[PDB]
Amino acid sequence: NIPLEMLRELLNLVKKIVEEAVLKSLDAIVASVMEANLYYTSFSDPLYLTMFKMLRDTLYYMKDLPTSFVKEIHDFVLEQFNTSQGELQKKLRCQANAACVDLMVWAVKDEQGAENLCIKLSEKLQSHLPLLICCLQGLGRLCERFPVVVHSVTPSLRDFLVISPVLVKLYKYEQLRDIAIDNICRCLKAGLTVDPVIVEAFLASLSNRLYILIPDHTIRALGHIAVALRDTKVMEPILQILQQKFCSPLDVLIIDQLGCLVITGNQYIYQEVWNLFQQISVKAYRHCSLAVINALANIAANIQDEHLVDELLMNLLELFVQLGLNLGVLIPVIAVLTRRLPPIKEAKPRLQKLFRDFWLYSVLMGFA
């Protein structure tokens, strides 16, 4: 229960300490002391960064604020931003600038103001790195708060992803990419929260873009959105898209995505993916022969439905007994699966027959 006048005097303190003349005087006395003869060298940038960081933090989570206070806060941050940013267009000031960005997005309460903020950030994006990442975070948060401007911000984020010279120069890394796709997923979920038809338009647009090294980014985004909507008319479209998108070293990470897709825990999806893997194994794209079993190695450790566990165990036992008619690589996954279960006492005699056949084949081949 902080009374308001303490906030007012804190604003007075912060506006008094951001004076530049006092900084110049401190620099002059620092020079006098240095020439008179110590850890710090220049106080201006560190003091400014500390003061802006505390300004951002100490007014971060505080709520229940009427109109005059927030409008004057917005005045402070906008005038400081205009004075500061419009001068370095010729180091550590970017952190303070990003603090100003994070503070000013809290002090907005009008949809038109949000639209103006999005327009300015879109203008600055399509051309310091902390400033860009904080701009992306602010765009994501603002889109999360206001569902109206989602269609306004949907293209601005996609055009950068589908087309990034800075990333190309950096390659010759991925944190910005993953935070960007996370913001994309948050924007999509916020949009579909209010409008049940925007997601269909977005998936149609991404399918059209896929039709026309962008496939790697597209596949990663598709995997991220698919795992994002695991709970929720939405799983069937992505299922059919991934079914129809098959077909080239680009197939290495597709099954990697399928391994994560297995986690969702749907009987039909599990049957489809297991049938696809069985067909691939029977045919043996020879290069994928290793990759697929690697996917199994990842699948074996990420199953939580016991029904799926026993079904997978039976399926791989049947696959092993069928392939007997090269076979020494299928044991590690069985060991990993069986190390997660207590010793078995009795079950369906089908399991007993499968185990007996497996041991018979093992002793025939002399693996023991």
Question: How many angstroms separate the CA atoms of 267 and 277, rounded?
Answer: 15
Q: Which two tokens stand for residue 345?
A: 């006492």
Resolution (A): 3.5
Count of positions (residues) in the chain: 368
Question: How many angstroms separate the CA atoms of 93 and 113, rounded?
Answer: 25
Non-local (6+) Cβ contacts of 51 within 8 A are: 14, 17, 18
Report yes or no: 223 and 185 within 8 Å, Cβ to Cβ.
Answer: no
Helix, strand, coil share of the chain (percent; to 5)? 75, 0, 25
**Which region, left, alpha or beta, applies to residue 288 given φ > 0 means left and ψ of -120 to 50 means alpha?**
alpha
Among candidate residues 309, 216, 218, the one with its CA nearest the CA of residue 270: 309
Task: Provide the 8-state DSSP code for 233.
Answer: -
Non-local (6+) Cβ contacts of 75 within 8 A are: none
Report yes or no: 148 and 113 within 8 Å, Cβ to Cβ.
Answer: no
Q: Count CB neighbours of 367 within 10 A.
A: 11
Among candidate residues 167, 107, 101, the one with its CA nearest the CA of residue 130: 101
- In degrees and rounded to multiples of 5, residue 209 shows phi and psi of -65, -40
Q: Count CB neighbours of 64 within 10 A.
A: 4
Report yes or no: 157 and 122 within 8 Å, Cβ to Cβ.
Answer: no
Question: How many angstroms separate the CA atoms of 143 and 36, rounded?
Answer: 56
Q: At what angle do helices 175-194 and 214-228 cross, to 10 degrees?
A: 50
The helix or strand, by DSSP H or E, that contains position 335, with its residue range, turns out to be helix 331-338
**Experiment type:** cryo-EM
Among candidate residues 134, 151, 252, the one with its CA nearest the CA of residue 198: 151
Q: Count CB neighbours of 3 within 10 A.
A: 7
Angstrom distances, CA of residue 139 to CA of 180, 186, 195: 10, 11, 19
Report yes or no: 258 and 273 within 8 Å, Cβ to Cβ.
Answer: yes
Residue holding tokens 């949809």? 111
Alpha-carbon torsion angle 205, 209, 213, 218, nearest 10: 30
Q: Which two tokens stand for residue 115?
A: 């639209």
238 in helix, strand or coil?
A: helix
Among candidate residues 135, 231, 137, 240, the one with its CA nearest the CA of residue 184: 137
Long-range contacts of 224-231 (CB under 8 A, 24+ apart): 224/181, 224/182, 224/184, 224/185, 225/184, 225/185, 225/188, 226/257, 226/261, 227/260, 227/261, 227/263, 227/264, 228/185, 228/188, 228/189, 229/189, 230/263, 230/264
Residue holding tokens 């338009």? 201
Pure H helices in 59-197: 67-85, 93-104, 111-125, 129-145, 150-162, 165-171, 175-194
Report yes or no: 113 and 79 within 8 Å, Cβ to Cβ.
Answer: no
Longest dimension (CA), the chain: 93
* Buried residues in 100-127 as b, exposed as e (16+ CB within 10 A): bbbbbbbbbeeeebbbebbeebbeeeee
Non-local (6+) Cβ contacts of 298 within 8 A are: 256, 259
Q: State the Cα angle at 311 between 308 and 315, rounded to 5°.
A: 135
- In degrees and rounded to multiples of 5, residue 20 shows phi and psi of -90, -30
| Residue 272: alpha-carbon gap to chain centroid | 27
Question: How many angstroms separate the CA atoms of 235 and 227, rounded?
Answer: 10
Pure H helices in 172-245: 175-194, 198-211, 214-228, 235-244
Among candidate residues 280, 243, 273, 238, the one with its CA nearest the CA of residue 258: 273
Question: How many angstroms separate the CA atoms of 2 and 64, rounded?
Answer: 11
Q: Which two tokens stand for residue 218?
A: 């597209």
Q: Which two tokens stand for residue 104?
A: 């000013």
Question: How many angstroms separate the CA atoms of 174 and 164, rounded?
Answer: 13
Q: Which two tokens stand for residue 22?
A: 């006092």
Non-local (6+) Cβ contacts of 311 within 8 A are: 270
Among candidate residues 362, 294, 286, the one with its CA nearest the CA of residue 328: 362
Alpha-carbon torsion angle 49, 52, 57, 61, nearest 10: -150
Question: How many angstroms separate the CA atoms of 244 and 182, rounded?
Answer: 25
Question: How many angstroms separate the CA atoms of 124 and 160, rounded?
Answer: 12
| Residue 176: alpha-carbon gap to chain centroid | 9
